[PDB]
């Protein structure tokens, strides 16, 4: 062996931290191959490999490695390690759609954190439980009681998280709680409360110079103001989102903000502006081969052109809408 | 008249992390 288990694992850690989980996995898998009798080290390798696979969207392997970690953490009596493995299992189960199992795992992380008087772990588990319940609520077709109950549970967990990270003075974590809390209120139809939460999210984003969080807050504020009937205000927030979005490598962000602006201007009965924004979304949806998006663009454009009496363009987009609609039949 | 999109911007998610650099922990 030219490198030891520990040496290989350390390189994997660094590669993953650097954003190259693919390369990191190779080093962790090399480390597991070499092996070690140090069970704490082995559990750390499994945990890191589980997270790397999670980030590479191999959720089955993520689950396998987080389970291997859980097994070892229990056998050596590493309570913190068991809590972490359980939280990781929960978050993996969440993405797989196994929400009720995710709840148990994430609650286990919470329970052990409390047993250990680990408030940082406790807070993180509360955030995770809010996230599981939020996604659970959406899985039931977001007004059905199963949706309302899960989303309300999400509010409760996010509020408990926010209290604890306020006690811990973790301002960036407060910002994250506010964002997810706001979007949960939004789904529940509590639009004023969504505005209150996203306003805090935005203030916190600005305190940190966090341009991504700022952009998210603008987008979510726009969304909430649409449902409050405040279309002009929504347009102002969506324009602020778009100013940032148009600079991003991920073109979907600009596309969505343009679609939203298109709809806002339709609601304001400014059909010329609506068309401008909808044409931008159409171009990007085509670039990204998003046929559902392209179809929705053609519908929105046809509606707007019709309102202006531009039947030549409206009918161009009717044809394309019909074509795409059959394709996505 | 309108087809509203289902997009909203959720916050970053976490995982719990371990490191072999915790070798000397009790």
Swiss-Prot record, chain A:
<feature type="repeat" description="TPR 3">
    <location>
        <begin position="83"/>
        <end position="116"/>
    </location>
</feature>
<feature type="repeat" description="TPR 5">
    <location>
        <begin position="175"/>
        <end position="208"/>
    </location>
</feature>
<comment type="similarity">
    <text>Belongs to the GPSM family.</text>
</comment>
<feature type="repeat" description="TPR 7">
    <location>
        <begin position="255"/>
        <end position="288"/>
    </location>
</feature>
<feature type="repeat" description="TPR 8">
    <location>
        <begin position="295"/>
        <end position="328"/>
    </location>
</feature>
<feature type="repeat" description="TPR 6">
    <location>
        <begin position="215"/>
        <end position="248"/>
    </location>
</feature>
<feature type="region of interest" description="Important for interaction with NUMA1; INSC and FRMPD1">
    <location>
        <begin position="3"/>
        <end position="329"/>
    </location>
</feature>
<comment type="subunit">
    <text>Interacts with the dynein-dynactin complex; this interaction is inhibited in a PLK1-dependent manner. Part of a spindle orientation complex at least composed of GNAI1, GPSM2 and NUMA1. Interacts with LLGL2. Interacts (via TPR repeat region) with INSC/inscuteable. Interacts (via TPR repeat region) with NUMA1 (via C-terminus); this interaction is direct, inhibited in a PLK1-dependent manner, prevents the binding of NUMA1 with SPAG5 and promotes spindle pole organization. INSC and NUMA1 compete for the same binding site, but INSC has higher affinity and can displace NUMA1 (in vitro).</text>
</comment>
<feature type="repeat" description="TPR 1">
    <location>
        <begin position="5"/>
        <end position="38"/>
    </location>
</feature>
<feature type="repeat" description="TPR 2">
    <location>
        <begin position="43"/>
        <end position="76"/>
    </location>
</feature>
<feature type="modified residue" description="Phosphoserine; by PKG">
    <location>
        <position position="325"/>
    </location>
</feature>
<protein>
    <recommendedName>
        <fullName>G-protein-signaling modulator 2</fullName>
    </recommendedName>
</protein>
<feature type="repeat" description="TPR 4">
    <location>
        <begin position="123"/>
        <end position="157"/>
    </location>
</feature>
<comment type="function">
    <text>Plays an important role in mitotic spindle pole organization via its interaction with NUMA1. Required for cortical dynein-dynactin complex recruitment during metaphase. Plays a role in metaphase spindle orientation. Also plays an important role in asymmetric cell divisions. Has guanine nucleotide dissociation inhibitor (GDI) activity towards G(i) alpha proteins, such as GNAI1 and GNAI3, and thereby regulates their activity.</text>
</comment>
<feature type="modified residue" description="Phosphoserine; by PKG">
    <location>
        <position position="113"/>
    </location>
</feature>
From Swiss-Prot, chain B:
<comment type="function">
    <text>Positive regulator of dendritic spine morphogenesis and density. Required for the maintenance of excitatory synaptic transmission. Binds phosphatidylinositol 4,5-bisphosphate.</text>
</comment>
<protein>
    <recommendedName>
        <fullName>FERM and PDZ domain-containing protein 4</fullName>
    </recommendedName>
</protein>
<comment type="subunit">
    <text>Interacts (via C-terminus) with DLG1, DLG2, DLG3 and DLG4/PSD95. Interacts (via N-terminus) with ARHGEF7; the interaction is mediated by the PDZ domain. Interacts with GPSM2 (via TPR repeat region).</text>
</comment>
């Amino acid at each position: 062996m030219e490198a030891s288990c520990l040496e290989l694992a350390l390189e994997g850690e660094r590669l993953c931290k650097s954003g190259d989980c693919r390369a990191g996995v190779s080093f962790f898998e090399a480390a597991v191959q070499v092996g070690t009798e140090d069970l704490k080290t082995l559990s750390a390798i499994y945990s890191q490999l589980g997270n790397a696979y999670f980030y590479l969207h191999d959720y089955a392997k993520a689950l396998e490695y987080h389970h291997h970690d859980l097994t070892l953490a229990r056998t050596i009596g590493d309570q913190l390690g068991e809590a972490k493995a359980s939280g990781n299992l929960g978050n993996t189960l969440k993405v797989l759609g196994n929400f009720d199992e995710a709840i148990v795992c994430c609650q286990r992380h919470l329970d052990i954190s409390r047993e250990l008087n680990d408030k940082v772990g406790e807070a993180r588990a509360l955030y995770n439980l809010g996230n599981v319940y939020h996604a659970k609520g959406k899985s039931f077709g977001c007004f059905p009681e199963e949706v309302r109950d899960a989303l309300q549970a999400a509010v409760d967990f996010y509020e408990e998280n926010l209290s604890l990270v306020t006690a811990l003075g973790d301002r960036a974590a407060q910002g994250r709680a506010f964002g997810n809390l706001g979007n949960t209120h939004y789904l529940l139809g509590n639009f004023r409360d969504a505005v209150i939460a996203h306003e805090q999210r935005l203030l916190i984003a600005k305190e940190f110079g966090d341009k991504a969080a700022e952009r998210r807050a603008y987008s979510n504020l726009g969304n909430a103001y649409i449902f409050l009937g405040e279309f002009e205000t929504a347009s102002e927030y969506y324009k602020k989102t778009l100013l940032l979005a148009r600079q991003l490598k991920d073109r979907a962000v600009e596309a969505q903000s343009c679609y939203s602006l298109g709809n806002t201007y339709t609601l304001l009965q400014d059909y010329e502006k609506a068309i401008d924004y909808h044409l931008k979304h159409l171009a990007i949806a085509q670039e990204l081969n998003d046929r559902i998006g392209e179809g929705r663009a053609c519908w929105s454009l046809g509606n707007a052109y019709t309102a202006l009496g531009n039947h030549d363009q409206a009918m161009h987009f009717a044809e394309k809408h019909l074509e795409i609609s059959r394709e996505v039949g | 008249q309108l087809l509203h999109s289902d997009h909203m911007e959720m916050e970053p998610e976490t995982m719990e992390t371990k490191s072999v650099t915790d070798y000397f922990s009790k």
